[PDB]
């Protein structure tokens with residue numbers, strides 16, 4: 001049994017290692033981030049991620065934020081994050097409805113507020129509330 | 143133990159998710175389809191797939207058929223499938239020798255019959271019996 | 285439980301199979317080799333591999349040697365291997381400090397010895413002791 005489990009863990013390490021080495025994904029602790037390289041709107045990203053068995057990425061620690069930023073930098077595009085203020089403005093929540101804890105707003109944001117329901121990450125890793133219809137790099141977490 | 147198994151299942155989900163997201167493979171239920179993008183004959187495809195620990199793909203449900211068709215469409219080439227009528231014509235079997243159940247013949251096929259031992263999938267997902275020496279997209283199942 | 289373990293092993297086979305089929309990695313027995321395609325010096329390769337959860341590759345059997353050689357051939361570059369003679373010349377050890385067993389020196393090597401601390405693999409799979417500051421294909425094992 002333990003030899004079976006050793007084998008299994010080893011093979012998982014190998015597959016993860018190859019995907020990491022080749023830049024196919026980025027792991028931060030127990031979270032994996034990845035992109036298909038496409039730039040599409042918020043609803044399309046959500047669909048793309050859930051179809052792959054994941055979720056549109058959202059950073060909950062500085063180290064997670066920096067990993068997503070590095071992907072934004074690599075593709076030179078902003079990234080939509082997994083949070084919205086669709087109910088009442090300024091009140092951002094994760095897509096499961098929980099209130100946001102970690103934030104990294106660009107100085108002065110969130111503002112501009114007509115309806116800026118979504119959040120985009122600039123390539124320096126800071127955040128801007130934005131409408132949800134822009135074409136942004138699809139980044140998923142697993 | 144259960145935490146160990148939770149960890150293992152999570153990591154498998156992550157690696158599968160990254161491969162899916164990036165278009166490296168397509169999963170239909172418990173079956174995974176993938177291509178190396180090469181176009182080669184039937185015997186070479188078989189070798190290529192078994193070397194990777196899989197088998198030349200064969201659809202057994204409409205949903206499996208559509209996944210392989212989508213790969214054929216993406217690469218704009220026909221796909222050899224894992225079935226033959228090498229013994230007596232019109233009598234198609236899977237490579238393990240079992241009689242074929244699900245079929246999706248293009249209207250009028252199978253015909254043309256000299257020796258058309260193999261089966262190719264057109265890019266609309268329908269099938270044609272064909273000789274085995276053509277260059278066709280290598281699609282494997284795992 | 286056994287169905288759970290069957291599922292897990294199957295999915296691992298699928299992910300390994302896709303990575304193999306697509307040329308992302310090469311498996312020899314229980315060892316996986318892979319490259320990010322970059323050419324950098326010895327210290328950088330070590331870092332690159334350990335960051336991915338692996339180690340700079342070193343062949344310990346003829347079959348492992350041939351797999352790394354095939355990657356060197358594919359990228360038309362020499363490969364730094366995971367061994368050094370930094371202590372006293374001619375005395376090569378793996379990075380964990382164990383004495384080297386399997387070798388495949390090009391005829392006449394190791395020689396040229398000023399300080400040739402590292403080992404590079406030529407594209408025919410044979411070895412040359414070399415300084416560690418050259419740009420060589422990064423090949424990792426997992």
Ligand SMILES: OC[C@H]1O[C@H](O)[C@@H](O)[C@@H](O)[C@@H]1O
Pocket residue numbers: 042043084085086117131132133
């Ligand atoms: O702007 C449209 C956009 O606004 C809403 O707040 C959200 O539910 C999004 O899912 C939707 O796509």
Ligand SMILES: OC[C@H]1O[C@H](O)[C@@H](O)[C@@H](O)[C@@H]1O
Pocket residue numbers: 055056057058082083093094095096097141
């Ligand atoms: O699991 C759902 C959860 O997944 C990710 O973390 C993000 O998309 C969140 O906004 C969402 O609440």
Ligand SMILES: OC[C@H]1O[C@H](O)[C@@H](O)[C@@H](O)[C@@H]1O
Pocket residue numbers: 109111112116128129130131
């Ligand atoms: O420059 C800040 C301001 O710029 C634009 O108007 C929009 O992208 C806003 O979301 C943002 O707040």
Ligand SMILES: OC[C@H]1O[C@H](O)[C@@H](O)[C@@H](O)[C@@H]1O
Pocket residue numbers: 184185226227228259273274275
């Ligand atoms: O045409 C040659 C072809 O014909 C036979 O029926 C099959 O066994 C194939 O494996 C073989 O490659």
Ligand SMILES: OC[C@H]1O[C@H](O)[C@@H](O)[C@@H](O)[C@@H]1O
Pocket residue numbers: 197198199200224225235236237238239283
């Ligand atoms: O496992 C063997 C089996 O694998 C795949 O489904 C196909 O190649 C079949 O034709 C073959 O019988």
Ligand SMILES: OC[C@H]1O[C@H](O)[C@@H](O)[C@@H](O)[C@@H]1O
Pocket residue numbers: 251253254258270271272273
């Ligand atoms: O067009 C139908 C007919 O076309 C060609 O002759 C061949 O590809 C046959 O296998 C096929 O049946």
Ligand SMILES: OC[C@H]1O[C@H](O)[C@@H](O)[C@@H](O)[C@@H]1O
Pocket residue numbers: 326327368369370401415416417
């Ligand atoms: O030439 C520099 C080189 O020489 C030493 O022997 C080794 O420890 C290497 O790690 C180092 O990079």
Ligand SMILES: OC[C@H]1O[C@H](O)[C@@H](O)[C@@H](O)[C@@H]1O
Pocket residue numbers: 339340341342366367377378379380381425
């Ligand atoms: O696990 C450490 C071990 O990993 C690989 O096999 C090589 O880099 C060796 O030189 C090293 O001793």
Ligand SMILES: OC[C@H]1O[C@H](O)[C@@H](O)[C@@H](O)[C@@H]1O
Pocket residue numbers: 393395396400412413414415
């Ligand atoms: O040709 C053999 C000789 O060539 C060069 O001088 C260097 O690469 C040496 O490491 C090697 O031994």
Ligand SMILES: [Ca+2]
Pocket residue numbers: 085089090110111113115116117129
């Ligand atoms: Ca707002």
Ligand SMILES: [Ca+2]
Pocket residue numbers: 109110111112113116128129130
């Ligand atoms: Ca704003």
Ligand SMILES: [Ca+2]
Pocket residue numbers: 227231232252253255257258259271
């Ligand atoms: Ca026929």
Ligand SMILES: [Ca+2]
Pocket residue numbers: 251252253254255258270271272
């Ligand atoms: Ca025909």
Ligand SMILES: [Ca+2]
Pocket residue numbers: 369373374394395397399400401413
């Ligand atoms: Ca030497």
Ligand SMILES: [Ca+2]
Pocket residue numbers: 393394395396397400412413414
């Ligand atoms: Ca030398």
